[PDB]
Every structure is written in structure tokens, then in C-alpha cells.
Design a protein around this ligand. Sequence first.
Ligand SMILES: O=C(NNC1=NCCC1)c1ccc(Br)cc1
Length: 330
Amino acid sequence: STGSATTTPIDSLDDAYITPVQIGTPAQTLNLDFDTGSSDLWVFSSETTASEVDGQTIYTPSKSTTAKLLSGATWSISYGDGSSSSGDVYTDTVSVGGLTVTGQAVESAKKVSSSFTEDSTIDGLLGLAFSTLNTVSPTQQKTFFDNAKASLDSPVFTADLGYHAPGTYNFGFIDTTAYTGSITYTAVSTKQGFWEWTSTGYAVGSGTFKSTSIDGIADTGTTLLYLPATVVSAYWAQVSGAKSSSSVGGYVFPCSATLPSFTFGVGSARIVIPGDYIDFGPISTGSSSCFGGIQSSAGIGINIFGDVALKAAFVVFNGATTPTLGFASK
Ligand SMILES: O=C(NNC1=NCCC1)c1ccc(Br)cc1
């Protein structure tokens, strides 16, 4: 089997991407944030505290003939941005882009934190990291990908995120028309439950490439590119007037600037992030200070190749017995 679904930016900044997902019988379509940095499929629901729902589409398990309470199971998750959610669990039929899994754990939110409430466009998350990170207790549950894997034509999914435009998540096949040149594959460590890999270095603009190992995760659920402070300082030093602002919470730059590109290494290959991808716009409405898309990972404990980086590439998440990651230009 295979599946193919379009993923769409939630706003003009590409702050996140949403992908329609069919849950239950008859189908209830919710727009979920596909997150390769976590491993829970959770949704706003008929169980979500009413004051914490503001415009989202909800899953109502009582209206699904295939929903079953997973008795005794609860879940609770915190994300890197300080957001969180928790609740109980159903199993139900879940389809993405024509690919169907029966018996998928669908985690129903009883509580969500304010950032989720305030984002009317995201109806939940669909985790695509390794199932060892799944938070369901007392019986950990599998991700949609892990449940689908054995049925897939090939045990892979791909992320092809757009810059200010829709893109695609494919399951079970590599669309050879969706990228240019060749795909360079690189080793993955699953020891922390993430798609963790080692970039071979970077360049800023037209500058020389610096060969240096940068361990990080491929995380579709993080907006920005978080890299070591040395690397980030070297980037922003090339932008007149750029500075790290403790009050704003990171690097800012004059909105009048033209940003340089940023290149990262994948083995001997190179992925170039155009400068425009690194512009996250005014820090507040009407401001001439703009927020940068490359920020320091200091204090995170790991580097994060979030959407800013991933959307510059066609990315293969190879879930074979020994997982790997592939990157191609596009
Ligand atoms: O939470 C993480 N990724 N997903 C999402 N973030 C916000 C909503 C979804 C995340 C994962 C690993 C590390 Br290290 C830091 C952050």
C-alpha cells in the first residue's frame, strides 16, 4: 500500500503545516500537524475541556462505529516549546492520503495548553518519531507509521514541505519526480527516539564550507533551525544590524535586510536554504525588527533541523530495520 497527502502552511510564515487525516467511521476529517519530533497521535475532541477549544475541529468517538475506548490508558505530553496536552485513548480507523490503519491509538485530549487553544488551525498532532517516545500509559502505543509499515510497498515516508506553499507527505514510496539530482542517505541514531543524524558542516551565503559534525534531529514539528551558538553567530554576523535580543528571545534583524543563504552538509552533499526562508517577519505587528529563522540551540541539549531546513529539501524517513535519512535538493 501507499498514501499521499498534501500538507499546507497554517499561516503566511510557514509556522507549521497541517495535513488532513480521516478518523473513524464515517470519517471525521481533522487537520493534524505531522511531527517527526514526537510519537503521539492526539486530537481535539468531544472530551476536551470546553474553555480550551476555540475554532478547532473535534473528534467525537461516540459518533464513530469503529471507535473503542482503550480501557485504562492515559497520555500526557510536553513539547519543546513548552506546550502540552493530555487525556485518554481510543482505538479507531485512521487514514492518511488513502493509506488506512485499523486499530490506531487516537489520543483524545481532555486538556491542552494555551498555545494549542489559541491556534485554531491545528486540530491535533500526528507523531512520526519512533514509538519508544509514545506517552500512552500503561501500554505504550505505536505510531501511525509503525502500524502501517508492514503493509507499505517500502517502509518509508517522505516529507516535501513547501516554502509559502503546500507540499506533500508520502507513505510507502519515493516520488522520483519530486526532487532534483540524487538522494544522499545518512545514518540515524534511534537511541533518543528521534530521527537523529549528523550533518557534516555548513556555509553562510557564498562563504567557504566549514567541515564540522553537527548532531541534530529532523523535526517537522519545529518551525525553525536551531544550531550551535558558534554557527548561529557566524550566520547573523553577515547581516548588518542583526543581534541577539534577550527580550525578544533570539536573533532579530532589520526587516530591510536581504538575508544570505545557509548551506548544511549531508555527507558529501549540500542542501541550500535560501535567505528568504530565514525571514520570520516582524517581531510584532508593524515593527521593523524581524525574527530570524536560524536560532541557537544552546540550552536545548540537541540541534534541531526544523521546517526552515527541511523545506529546502526532499526528505526520506527510511524506517527499514536500520533506519536512515535521505536528503535531496528540489
Ligand atoms: O516538540 C518537539 N517537536 N514537535 C513539536 N514541537 C511543537 C509542537 C510539535 C521537539 C522535539 C525534540 C526536541 Br530536542 C525539541 C522539540
